[PDB]
C-alpha cells in the first residue's frame with residue numbers, strides 16, 4: 001500500500017485512498033478536495049494545481065490546462081487543430097506529436113502532453129503523501145471510455161514519468177459504477193453514467209455482470225460543461241450592470257473575468273439555495289456591483305443547455321439498442337450534476353427513477369479508482 005486512486009481530469013483532478021475498508025478523498029494544501037489540472041511556467045518556477053490556476057489571468061500564455069485533450073494524439077488530428085484555435089498557449093509539432101510551447105526562466109521550452117500530465121500526477125501524489133505520510137508507490141488512474149490505446153498508454157507514461165506503478169488504467173464510467181458498488185449490487189445490469197463536468201459532457205452505457213464491465217455506447221459533447229452555464233450568467237449580469245450604471249464592461253477583459261469568477265461561485269450556491277449574492281467591489285470605474293440572482297433566473301438563462309443534455313442520453317440508448325426502461329442504474333458524475341434542474345430533467349426522462357448521487361459527483365471517479373487499487377494490491 002497505500003491503495004491510491006487518481007481521477008486525472010481535463011481541468012480538475014481528484015485523489016482518494018482506500019483505508020480501513022472505506023475511501024477517503026484527499027484535500028490538497030488549500031483544503032480543496034479537487035485540484036486544477038493546471039501547470040504554469042513563470043520567470044522563476046513551475047506552479048501546479050491551485051497555485052497555477054490562481055495566476056492564470058496574469059500569465060495566460062504560459063499556463064497549461066486541457067493537456068488531456070492532446071495526450072496520445074497526433075498534431076495533425078482534427079480535434080487538436082480545432083482545439084488549438086481556443087487555447088491562449090501555443091501548441092507546436094515534434095516528430096508529428098503535439099507539444100505545448102511556453103516561456104520558462106526566460107527561454108522557450110516545449111513539453112509533451114504526458115509531461116504536463118506527469119506534473120499534475122506528481123502534485124496528486126504529493127497531496128496523498130502529505131495526507132498519509134511516507135511514499136505512494138502505486139495508483140489506479142482513470143481515462144474516458146472512448147480513449148484509444150495510444151491515449152491510454154500516453155496517460156500511463158505520465159504515471160511512469162511521475163514514478164508511479166500504474167496498477168491499471170480503467171474507464172471513468174467504470175470507476176463511478178465501482179464507487180457505488182454496482183458490480184456487487186446474479187444477472188446483468190445496464191448502467192448509465194451521466195458525467196457533466198466543467199467543460200465536458202460524457203454519457204456512457206455499461207453492462208455489469210459477475211463483476212465484468214463492458215462499454216455498450218458512449219455519447220456526449222466534448223465542449224459542453226459548467227463553464228457554459230457560467231457564461232450565460234455573465235451575459236445576463238453584464239447587461240444588468242449596463243442597465244443600472246450605463247457602463248458596458250464588455251471591452252474590459254479584467255471586468256468580464258471578475259464577473260465570471262462571481263458567477264461561478266453564485267452558480268455553486270444555487271445548487272443548494274434558491275438565491276445567491278454577487279458582491280464585486282469596484283467592478284468598473286470605481287462602481288461596485290452588488291446584486292442577487294435566483295435559481296429560477298439561472299435555470300431560465302440555461303433552458304436550452306440543460307434540456308439539451310437529454311439528447312446524448314437518447315443517442316447512447318439508440319447506439320446501445322436499449323429502451324430507457326432497460327437502464328437499472330443511473331450514476332451522476334461531475335460537479336454540474338449537482339444542479340437541481342439537471343437532476344429533475346434526467347429523473348423525469350427516466351420516469352421518476354432515483355439517481356445514484358450520494359457520492360460527491362466530482363469525487364466518484366477517484367473514489368472508484370481507489371476501491372479498484374485496493375482490490376489489485378489485495
Ligand SMILES: NC(=O)c1cnccn1
Pocket residue numbers: 231232234235238239249250251256
Ligand atoms: N459572456 C461574456 O463573456 C460577456 C457578456 N457580455 C459582455 C461581455 N462578456
